[PDB]
């Protein structure tokens, strides 16, 4: 069993805190159950969380493996090895300019804003904002509601893919959580341990994760996406419940 999980609103709250999920991570660990972060956050945001490879960044754009991963894959980049699944940031940024000209409205993303601007919009510190700006694959967008339809068509016209985390929209190409989750199972040292994957998430950019796992659990605020399990309370408390009720029994 491998547990794949979203961060914000799932394993943590929107404020980084694990809450009633730490004790639920403790257990999973104690029973040797692998937990893999699958997030829209960048590498630097994940590291700041004290979280360790393997994990998936930027909506599936990047898979990170411990430098000494028993299955040789990707290219050494830091003290990890990286398997890039999506266009690099810079290509996405280029395409966005074409999208912008086509739409005839400003299309502003984190790459256009100062760290201080990103901080003010998100409620983060200047440092946390620097780390959110260190993007390698995926772009976070700041769209006013009124311009959204026009902008999403403009993205599709110039070949970009879009999703959202619940506040801000994201633009990328080849970044998909299922895809990255599927790749990592296929790179897993123990094929029996990876045989049964669990998936937990909270927003739209989680459906692809739900579809690439064998047990899908939604701990968000709405109605669960079709044929995915729900918990009594959102977030980490939903996470805790999921483990107690859905996981350890199986375990």
Cα distances (Å, whole numbers) of residue 153 to 81, 96, 102, 150, 161: 35, 12, 9, 6, 10
Contact 234, 221 (CB under 8 A): yes
Alpha-carbon gap, residue 37 to 14, rounded angstroms: 15
| Residue 138 in the binding site for Gd ion (CB under 5 A) | no
202 marked ligand binding residue: yes
Residues 96-115 that bind a second copy (CB under 8 A): 97, 100, 105-106, 108, 111-114
Residue 202 binds which of a second copy, Gd ion, Cl ion, none (CB < 5-8 A, kind-dependent): Gd ion
Contact between 59 and Cl ion per CB under 5 A = no
144 binds, among Gd ion, a second copy, Cl ion, none (CB under 5 to 8 A by kind): a second copy
**Residue tagged 């772009």 (tokens):** 139
**HSE of 86, CA atoms in CB hemisphere, 13 A:** 33
Nearer to a second copy among residue 148 and residue 194 (C-beta): 148
The alpha-carbon radius of gyration of the chain (Å, integer) is 18
The answer to whether 8 is annotated as binding is yes
Name every residue whose Cβ is closer than 8 Å to that of residue 37 and which is 6 or more positions away in sequence.
5, 7, 11, 46, 49, 51, 55, 56
Does 214 appear as a known binding residue?
no
Q: Is 142 in the site for a second copy (CB under 8 A)?
A: yes
- Residues designated catalytic: 6
68 annotated ligand-binding residue: no
Smallest separation (angstroms) from a second copy to the CB of 53: 31
> Is residue 120 close enough to count as binding a second copy by CB under 8 A?
yes
Number of residues engaging a second copy in binding (CB under 8 A): 18
* Among candidate residues 1, 2, 10, 3, the one with its CA nearest the CA of residue 206: 10
Binding site for Cl ion (CB under 5 A): 7-8, 39-40
Residues that bind a second copy (CB under 8 A): 97, 100, 105-106, 108, 111-114, 116-117, 120-121, 142, 144-147
């Amino acid at each position: 069993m491998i547990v794949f999980t979203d961060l914000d609103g799932t394993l943590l709250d929107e404020r980084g805190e694990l809450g009633p999920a730490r004790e639920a991570l403790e257990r999973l660990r104690a029973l040797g159950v692998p937990v893999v972060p699958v997030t829209a956050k960048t590498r630097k945001e994940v590291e700041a969380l004290g979280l360790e490879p393997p994990f998936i960044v930027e909506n599936g754009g990047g898979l990170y493996l411990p430098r000494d991963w028993p299955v040789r894959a990707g290219r050494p980049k830091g003290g990890y090895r990286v398997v890039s699944l999506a266009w690099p940031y810079r290509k996405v940024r280029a395409r966005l300019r074409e999208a912008e000209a086509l739409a005839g409205r400003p299309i502003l993303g984190y790459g256009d804003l100062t760290a201080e601007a990103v901080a003010r919009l998100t409620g983060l510190s200047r440092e946390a904002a620097r780390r959110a700006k260190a993007r390698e694959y995926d772009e976070t967008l700041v769209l006013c509601p009124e311009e959204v339809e026009a902008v999403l068509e403009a993205l599709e016209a110039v070949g970009l893919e879009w999703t959202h985390g619940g506040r801000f929209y994201h633009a990328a190409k080849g970044a998909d959580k299922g895809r990255a989750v599927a790749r990592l199972r296929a790179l897993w040292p123990d094929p029996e341990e990876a045989r049964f994957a669990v998936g937990l998430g909270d927003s739209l950019n989680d459906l692809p994760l739900f579809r690439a796992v064998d047990l899908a659990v939604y701990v968000g605020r709405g109605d669960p996406p079709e044929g995915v399990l729900a918990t009594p309370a959102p977030g980490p408390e939903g996470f805790r419940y999921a483990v107690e009720r859905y996981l350890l029994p199986r375990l």
